[PDB]
Structure formats: C-alpha cells, structure tokens
Structure 1
Amino acid sequence: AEAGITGTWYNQLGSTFIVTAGADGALTGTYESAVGNAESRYVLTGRYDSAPATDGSGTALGWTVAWKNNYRNAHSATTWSGQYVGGAEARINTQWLLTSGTTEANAWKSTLVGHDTFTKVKP
C-alpha cells in the first residue's frame, strides 16, 4: 500500500523525510532536518515491496541518501533497511549503514551502524 507509506515521517533525532511510493515499487523524496531549509535537504531514492503479504506482516523497504547537495558534501552515503507497519500508530522501523569515502588505510573504519524509528507524528 503506497497509500500508507507516502507522506511525511519523523524520527527520534529530529530528522524529517517526505517520500512518495510509486505503484511500481519505487521510493522518491527528500531527507531533511528539523527546520527543513534548502541547506539540509538531500535527495533520497529507494525501493519497497509493492505487493506485501496480507497476513499481518510488515512491508519491506529501503532507501539511500548520498550526503551531497548544492550547499555541502560530506562525502558519504547512508542506507536504511527496514519495514513499514501500518495502523493507528504507523511506523517504519529501520537499521542503517553510513559509509564515508576513505583512503585504503582507513577503510576498516569506514562504516557506522545504527537504528532509526520513524512515525507520522513529530516526537
């Protein structure tokens, strides 16, 4: 149900992301901060299960954000992997990986891992 995913989502850290779920399984949108100003907005692209199981299971999805826009470039990219769960209190539960461009010597410490939970209502 792209109807359930499309919209505005907020996480615990205060970040915001507006996404559109295409009937074909594509995710497109923008990822921004609290205030949400041109400087903190970044393009996001991903994919999701457009025909999920109707047995109460969640909807699998994932997206990527490369941290470069017209104002800054952090030379890094983050991918979020998780599932959408609908209902009175809908939410998208995820785990993410943040990789920075590094020299070969520092490659071993190039990737961070964490978890994010997004809801339809500000925290």
Structure 2
Amino acid sequence: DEAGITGTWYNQLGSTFIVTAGADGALTGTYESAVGNAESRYVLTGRYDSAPATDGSGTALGWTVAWKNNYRNAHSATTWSGQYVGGAEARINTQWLLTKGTTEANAWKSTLVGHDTFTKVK
C-alpha cells in the first residue's frame, strides 16, 4: 500500500497529514494541526506494515510528532496508532496518545488520549 498511503490526508479537525510511505516500511512527512499549541508544519516519522494480510484486513501503521518546530515548542509528543483501509473512500483510522513533559508530581496527568480519522478529501 505504498501508493495507497503516500499523499495528503485530512482529519476531522482539519489537520493536514502529509506522508511518504517507503518500500522499506518507513513513513516520513509533516503534520499541521488545526488545533492546540501548534503552528505550521512539524516533522513526523513512523512505520507501516509493508506486507499486509491479503484477507481484507487493514494495514497497521503508526507515527510520531514532537511538537517543536521553528515557531513553537509545546513540550509534547503525539503518537498515532492505526490502520489504513483502502478502497473508493480510503481511510486511516487512528487512536493517539499525546504526552506532555511534566514534573514527577504532575506525571499522572501527562497523557491525553483521542481518536482521529483521516480521509483523502476535506
């Protein structure tokens, strides 16, 4: 699904996920969040299953953004874990974990959890 995954994707929040899937299982690109302490593009890297099952199952993948770029630093990182589902209306369905750097006293509230669905349109 190298060609299926490679390109520009948009989630329900209007964030933009620009990704290249490599033959070797690599994901590289940029992420622009429509929400939160973020502006412009941030580097992302990740991995995907480059030899998925042929039984109609989705293709497992994940990637990370650390929320530091030349404009801002939100001292946090989000990882999206999900699967790519091919077809006429292709989707990447994910769950994510956003961890902020905290003191030990505040570590219990370090991590947000959510879910993003990415499509090729929007």
What TM-score, normalized to structure 2? 0.94
Q: Using the alignment, how far apart are the partners of 2:73 and 2:37 within structure 1? A: 16
- Once the two structures are superposed, residues 47-86 of structure 1 have per-residue CA deviations (whole angstroms, 9 ceiling, x without a partner) of 0000000110000000000000011000000000000000
- In the other structure, the counterpart of 2:29 is 29
Q: Is the 8 A contact 2:38 2:67 kept in 1?
A: no
Question: What SS does the aligned partner of 2:67 have?
Answer: strand
- In the other structure, the counterpart of 1:7 is 7
**Alpha-carbon deviation of 1:32?**
1.0
Q: Percent identity?
A: 99
What TM-score, normalized to structure 1? 0.93
**Alpha-carbon deviation of 1:11?**
0.2
- In the other structure, the counterpart of 1:82 is 82
> Structure 1 residues 30, 110: CA separation in 2 closer, same or farther (over 3 Å shift)?
same
CA RMSD of aligned residues (A): 2.3
Aligned residues: 121
- Once the two structures are superposed, residues 93-113 of structure 1 have per-residue CA deviations (whole angstroms, 9 ceiling, x without a partner) of 000000000000000110000
**Alpha-carbon deviation of 1:39?**
4.1
- In the other structure, the counterpart of 1:118 is 118
Q: Where in structure 1 do 4 or more consecutive aligned residues deviate above 2 Å?
A: 33-39
Question: What SS does the aligned partner of 2:39 have?
Answer: helix
Q: Using the alignment, how far apart are the partners of 1:39 and 1:49 within structure 2? A: 30
Q: Using the alignment, how far apart are the partners of 1:89 and 1:36 within structure 2? A: 28
> Structure 1 residues 74, 63: CA separation in 2 closer, same or farther (over 3 Å shift)?
same
> Structure 1 residues 89, 36: CA separation in 2 closer, same or farther (over 3 Å shift)?
farther
5+ residue gaps in structure 2?
none
- Once the two structures are superposed, residues 27-54 of structure 1 have per-residue CA deviations (whole angstroms, 9 ceiling, x without a partner) of 0000014599994210000000000001
Q: Using the alignment, how far apart are the partners of 1:52 and 1:31 within structure 2? A: 25
